[PDB]
Design a protein around this ligand. Structure first.
Ligand SMILES: *[C@H](C/C=C\CC)[C@H](O)C/C=C\C/C=C\C/C=C\C/C=C\CCC(=O)O
Ligand SMILES: *[C@H](C/C=C\CC)[C@H](O)C/C=C\C/C=C\C/C=C\C/C=C\CCC(=O)O
Lengths: 293, 293
C-alpha cells in the first residue's frame, strides 16, 4: 500500500538506518540529489520536480522519521538527531561522492546539522521556507496587524501535555486544509483530492504525534545550532522564499547570509509557503538550473 | 438553574440593554462598583471579592455578552461596541453619580472605550492582567526559549474557519485546564470542580464562539483605540499584575502610564494571570483600599 502515487519510472522502497525503517521514493541516474519535505506533507510535495531532476540526477525523496511511511526516530526529534538518519541514508546511495540537498520547512531543521558537520559530503544546497533554528525565532511576533503570524504554530505544536494532538485528533483533515491554505498565496492548487491524500498520511496517530515532536525539540535544536554555527557553510547555496501570503520574503536570504559564504536568494512573487505546488514552474526552473551548474 | 453559586446576600438577575439580555450578580449598598471578568471565566471569578466589597459599595458583576448567562451582542465584539452595553448597564444602576470599574483580561478591552469616552461617569479605575489593545501587542513574541508563549492564543483565537471552536469542541474541559495552568503560577487554587464549572459554561456553543469573537475583533479594537487614546484618562487609576509565571510584570503599569495621568501600580510576587483566584487575599486588599480612599 502506498500513501501517494509514485511517478512513472520511480520506485517506492525502504531502508533501515540505525534501526529506523525509512521510506523513500527514488529514480533517475547520475549524481545524487536528496529532497527533504516539511511539516504537513511527505515526499510527495516533490513529485512534479522529481521527473525533471531525474533526467540528469539520481533523485531520492525520503519521508521524515515518523511521517509519511517512515518509522519514528529512536534517538529523538532534534535537528542533530534526525540529521544523522538523513545523512546516513544519502550516503548509502552516494558513499564515494558528494550529493546535493534540497529542503523545505522543517526539512531545513532536520538537515542543517549534517550539512555543517559533513560539508565535504554536500555539493550544492537549496533551502526554502524555514528559518534555521536560532535565537531569531524568539523575536517573531505572536500576532500581526495584517494577515496572520506565520509563527504562532510553534507554540501550539510545542505545548506540553500533548495539547495539539489532543485537540486535532478526529479533526485532522479540517486542520490540514486550514493551515495549508492560511500559509498559501495560490490556494487554488490545494484541491480537496490533494488535501485528502496529505490528511490521510498525517492523521496516522504516530504521525500526528511525530509531527509535533519536531516542534517540542525546537529549543533543543536552537541550542545545538548555537554551537554548530561557529563554522559557516562553504558550499554553493541557494535560498527560495515566497513573496506572497505565507512567504518569508527577504528573511530567508538575509538569515542564510549569516550561515553561508556563497549564497544567492530568490523571492517568488505571488507565492506563499508551499512553493513546489503554488509556483511549480518558476520554482522547478530555479532548482534545476542551480543544481545543473 | 445557575451556572455558578451566588454568594449570600447577592441576587442573580437580568437586564435588557440595547436589545441584549445581560446577566449579572448584584449585592451591597452604597456607590456602584462594576467588576468585569475575562476570557475563560464569568462573573464568578469575582465571588470572593464581592462580599467584602459589598460592605461599602453596591457591587455588580455582569457576564460579558455571549459568555456566562448573557446573550451575545447584537452589534459586534469590538471594544467600542461591547463597552456600550457595559456602560449602559452600569448607568441603569448608577444614573446620578460616577461609578468604579474593576476589569480583568478582556474585561479591559471591553471597557476602555466607554471609560475614555465617558470620563465623568467613572470615579476610579482598576485594571489587571491585560494589555489595552494597541500597537504594543504586535511585539509580543510567538515562541520562547522555554516553550509556548503567553500570547500565541491571540492568533489561535483570531483565526478564521472557526478554527478554535472546531478544535476545542469535545475537549473544552481539557483545553481550559491547559490554558488556566499555562497562565498560572498557583495551580493549586483551581480545584477540579472549579475547572468543571468554568468549562461547562464556556462549552455552550454560543459561548465558545463568543469567546473567540472577542479575539477576531482585536485588530479592529486596536484601530479604534488608536483614535480614542488621543484623550488621556484623568480619573484615579490602579493597575495590578502578577509577578510569577503567567503574570505581565511591569508591562501593565508601564503601558497604563501612557494612557492615564494619575496611576499607581503593583506587581504581586508568586501570582500569575488569575489574580482573583491565585492571590485572592492581597488582590482583594489592594482593590478594597484603593476604592475606599
Ligand atoms: C513549517 C510551516 C508550515 C506549516 C505551518 C502550520 C515550519 O513550521 C515553519 C516554516 C516557515 C515559517 C516560520 C517562520 C517564518 C520565518 C520568519 C518570519 C518572517 C519574517 C520575520 C520578521 C521578524 O523579524 O519578525
Ligand atoms: C486573556 C488571557 C487569558 C487566558 C489565556 C488563554 C487575554 O487574552 C490576555 C491577557 C493576559 C495574558 C497574560 C500574559 C500575556 C499578555 C500580555 C504580554 C505582556 C507582557 C509580556 C510578558 C511575557 O510574555 O513574559
Amino acid at each position: 500500500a502506498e500513501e501517494f502515487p509514485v511517478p512513472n519510472g520511480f520506485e517506492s522502497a525502504y531502508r533501515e538506518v540505525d534501526g529506523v525503517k525509512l521510506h523513500y521514493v527514488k529514480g533517475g541516474q547520475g549524481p545524487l540529489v536528496m529532497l527533504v519535505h516539511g511539516f504537513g506533507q511527505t515526499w510527495y510535495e516533490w513529485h512534479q520536480l522529481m521527473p525533471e531532476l531525474a533526467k540528469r540526477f539520481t533523485v531520492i525523496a525520503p519521508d521524515l522519521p515518523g511521517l509519511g511511511q517512515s518509522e519514528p526516530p529512536k534517538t529523538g526529534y532534534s535537528g542533530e538527531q534526525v540529521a544523522v538518519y538523513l545523512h546516513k541514508l544519502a550516503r548509502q546511495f552516494s558513499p564515494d561522492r558528494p550529493f546535493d540537498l534540497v529542503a523545505h520547512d522543517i526539512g531545513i531543521w532536520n538537515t542543517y546539522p549534517m550539512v555543517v558537520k559533513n560539508q565535504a559530503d554536500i555539493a550544492r544546497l537549496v533551502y526554502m521556507q524555514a528559518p534555521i533554528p536560532d535565537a531569531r525565532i524568539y523575536r517573531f511576533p505572536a500576532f500581526t496587524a495584517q494577515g496572520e503570524s506565520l509563527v504562532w504554530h510553534f507554540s501550539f505544536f510545542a505545548a506540553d501535555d500533548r495539547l495539539a494532538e489532543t485537540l486535532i485528533a478526529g479533526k485532522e483533515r479540517f486542520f490540514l486544509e486550514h493551515f495549508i491554505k492560511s500559509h498559501a498565496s495560490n490556494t487554488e492548487v490545494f484541491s480537496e483530492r490533494l488535501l485528502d491524500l496529505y490528511a490521510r498520511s498525517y492523521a496516522k496517530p504516530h504521525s500526528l504525534n511525530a509531527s509535533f515532536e519536531y516542534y517540542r525539540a525546537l529549543n533543543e535544536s536552537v541550542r545545538q545550532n548555537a554551537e554548530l554555527a561557529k563554522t559557516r557553510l562553504q558550499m554553493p547555496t541557494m535560498t527560495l522564499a515566497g513573496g506572497g501570503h505565507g512567504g518569508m520574503g527577504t528573511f530567508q536570504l538575509e538569515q542564510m547570509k549569516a550561515y553561508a559564504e556563497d549564497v544567492e536568494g530568490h523571492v517568488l512573487p505571488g507565492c506563499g509557503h508551499w512553493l513546489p505546488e503554488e509556483c511549480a514552474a518558476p520554482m522547478n526552473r530555479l532548482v534545476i538550473d542551480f543544481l545543473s551548474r
